[PDB]
Structures are given as structure tokens and as C-alpha cells.
Write a protein that binds this ligand. Structure first.
Ligand code: H3X
Ligand code: OGA
Ligand code: FE
Length: 278
């Protein structure tokens, strides 16, 4: 893996370009003996990750599908989130995330859900660990289903205004050196790059499935080098409005120029239902 002044090379796990062209893809989170766990495989592919820091303030959610915003929070809230304080996450941090999205987008309503505190080499399952496969958190069907599930009677009225789904990512230890969150220019995503994958649990059908991405040389991947706890990444998973980037995609990668004995990456990401705004 080589690198330069504003980019480096690594790899991420992609699905095949023809994945799901014969049957629906599924991945059993709780695999049981006798039943097939998955009908597809991820494969690593070389990717050039361009450093976003030289042009950090120039990426916006409409043109690229992601943005980086300065937002400082108290070190006490960080240590509480690091201590698995569920009350601090669903209370103070949810209010912090909603206020940050409101002042960035001017939106009317923000609904937080599905918090994921991650640690490198953790044991809190897969979702307490950095993501290794390139994904978009919600398909359009998943984003609409989540609105009806979390907003209920107000879903139809809210879906008449602009609806967006965000992943609000923030590191808990700084700076992020290893396993950073890469993001792709949404304008460089082809429709053939998106593959719905149903994550199964005890045979329950996944009505909120994500997109899994296949590699493409056209994809321009970015990452904010040495990201700090005061720099928040907002990655767009869905957008009802037709913009140059209807969505983005994200994944973590092994940085090739970081010492092996570096402290493990720690972060928390929260999904957002965003209504209105610009
Ligand atoms: C390697 O990267 C990953 O495995 C991703 C990941 O880390 C997580 C945490 C996920 O959460 C998903 C799918 C992803 C994006 C996976 C693909 C599933 C598995 C649980 C929660 C749901 C939910 C909130 C109900 O919304 C849905 O639309 C269905 C898909 C998500 C967003
Ligand atoms: O933090 C990671 O490694 C992966 N994060 C996400 O998938 C997210 O924020 O939605
Ligand atoms: Fe994600």
C-alpha cells in the first residue's frame, strides 16, 4: 500500500458487481445449524482514499452526500458514552445530535434511533466494531418503513416534505488514526453498485435492509485524516429530493501508515430521520 501527501491506499470489503442478480441476498446474523448463513460473499478490493482535510469545509450533503461539521461536546459526555451509559446516549447525545442536524440543514424535525458505540477489537458483537463492508444504511424501502415505525400517525404528513436519513458519526477517542470512516462521492455511485442485503434474525424478515456496495473504479473515496471528537461526519443514507448525490456510502479501512500498537478506534454513530430543511 502506497501513499502520497493527500491520499493513501488500502482496501475494503465489497460484494460482487452481479450480487443479487439471481435471487435476493441475505445474511443471517444468528446462524443456525442446517440452514445456510448467507448466499453471497464479500471480497476485498484496492481503494485509493483521498484525504478530505485539505478541503474539509467544501463537502456538502447535496453535492457529495456527506459533510464534516465542527461540533464540540463536553469530555464528561464522551466518557459517559464510552462507559456504555445508555441514558446519556438516548438523552443528552440524542439532543446534541438533533440540534447539530437542525443547525446544519435547517430542518423542522429530527428523530434519532439505533445508536452504535464501536470499539476496535471489541466483543459487543459486530455492531460494536468498525464496519468492514461498504454499505448504505437504508434502502429507500427501509427509510420509508422506519418513518412509519418511529413517527406512526405523523409519517404520511412528514413524508410530504423533504425526507432524509443520516448517519451521524463522531469519534470518542482522538485523533482517529486507525480504522477511519471512509465516505464516497455520491455522484460517483452507479445504480449497479447498490445491492440490497437482508440481514436475518431468527428467520424474521428484514423490512429495514441496507445497501451493500460493489467496487467501481469511478468511485471517488474520501476520509478525514486524524479526525477529532469535535469533527462530526454526517453521511446521507437517503434523500427524497433529486440532488447530485441522492446518497453516499461509508466503510472503515485499515490505514497502512499507522503504527500497529496504536490505541483501538472508538466512536459512536447515530441514525437520523430528517424532515424539511435545505
Ligand atoms: C458492515 O456494515 C454493516 O454491517 C452495517 C452496519 O454496521 C449496521 C450497523 C447496520 O445496521 C443495519 C444494516 C447495517 C447498515 C449494516 C449493513 C442492520 C443490520 C441493523 C439496523 C438496520 C436498521 C437501523 C433497522 O435500518 C435498516 O434500514 C436496515 C439496515 C440497518 C441500518
Ligand atoms: O463506524 C464505523 O465503522 C461504521 N459506521 C457506520 O456504519 C455508520 O456510521 O452508519
Ligand atoms: Fe453505516
Amino acid at each position: 500500500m502506497v501513499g502520497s501527501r493527500t491520499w493513501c491506499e488500502s482496501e475494503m470489503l465489497f460484494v460482487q458487481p452481479d450480487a443479487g442478480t439471481k435471487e435476493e441476498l441475505y445474511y443471517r446474523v444468528t446462524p443456525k445449524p442446517g440452514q445456510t448463513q448467507a448466499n453471497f460473499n464479500w471480497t476485498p478490493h484496492k481503494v485509493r482514499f483521498h484525504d478530505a482535510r485539505p478541503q474539509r469545509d467544501s463537502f456538502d450533503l447535496n453535492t457529495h452526500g456527506f459533510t464534516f461539521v465542527e461540533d464540540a461536546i463536553s469530555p464528561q459526555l464522551i466518557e459517559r458514552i464510552r462507559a456504555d451509559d445508555t441514558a446519556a446516549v438516548e438523552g443528552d447525545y440524542f439532543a446534541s445530535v438533533a440540534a447539530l442536524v437542525k443547525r446544519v440543514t435547517g430542518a423542522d424535525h429530527v428523530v434519532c434511533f439505533s445508536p452504535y458505540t464501536r470499539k476496535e477489537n471489541s466483543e459487543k458483537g459486530i455492531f460494536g466494531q468498525p464496519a468492514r463492508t461498504v454499505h448504505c444504511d437504508h434502502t429507500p424501502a427501509a427509510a420509508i418503513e422506519l418513518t412509519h415505525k418511529l413517527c406512526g400517525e405523523d409519517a404520511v404528513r412528514l413524508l410530504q416534505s423533504r425526507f432524509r436519513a443520516f448517519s451521524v458519526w463522531r469519534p470518542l477517542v482522538e485523533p482517529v488514526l486507525d480504522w477511519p470512516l471512509a465516505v464516497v462521492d455520491g455522484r460517483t455511485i452507479a445504480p449497479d453498485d447498490l445491492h440490497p442485503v437482508h440481514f436475518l434474525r431468527y428467520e424474521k424478515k428484514d423490512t429495514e435492509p441496507p445497501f451493500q456496495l460493489s467496487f467501481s473504479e469511478t468511485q471517488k473515496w474520501y476520509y478525514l485524516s486524524r479526525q477529532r471528537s469535535d469533527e462530526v461526519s454526517i453521511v446521507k443514507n437517503y434523500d427524497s429530493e433529486v440532488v447530485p448525490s441522492p446518497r453516499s456510502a461509508h466503510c472503515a479501512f485499515k490505514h497502512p501508515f499507522v503504527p500497529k500498537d496504536a490505541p483501538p478506534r472508538e466512536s459512536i454513530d447515530v441514525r437520523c430521520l430528517v424532515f424539511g430543511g435545505r
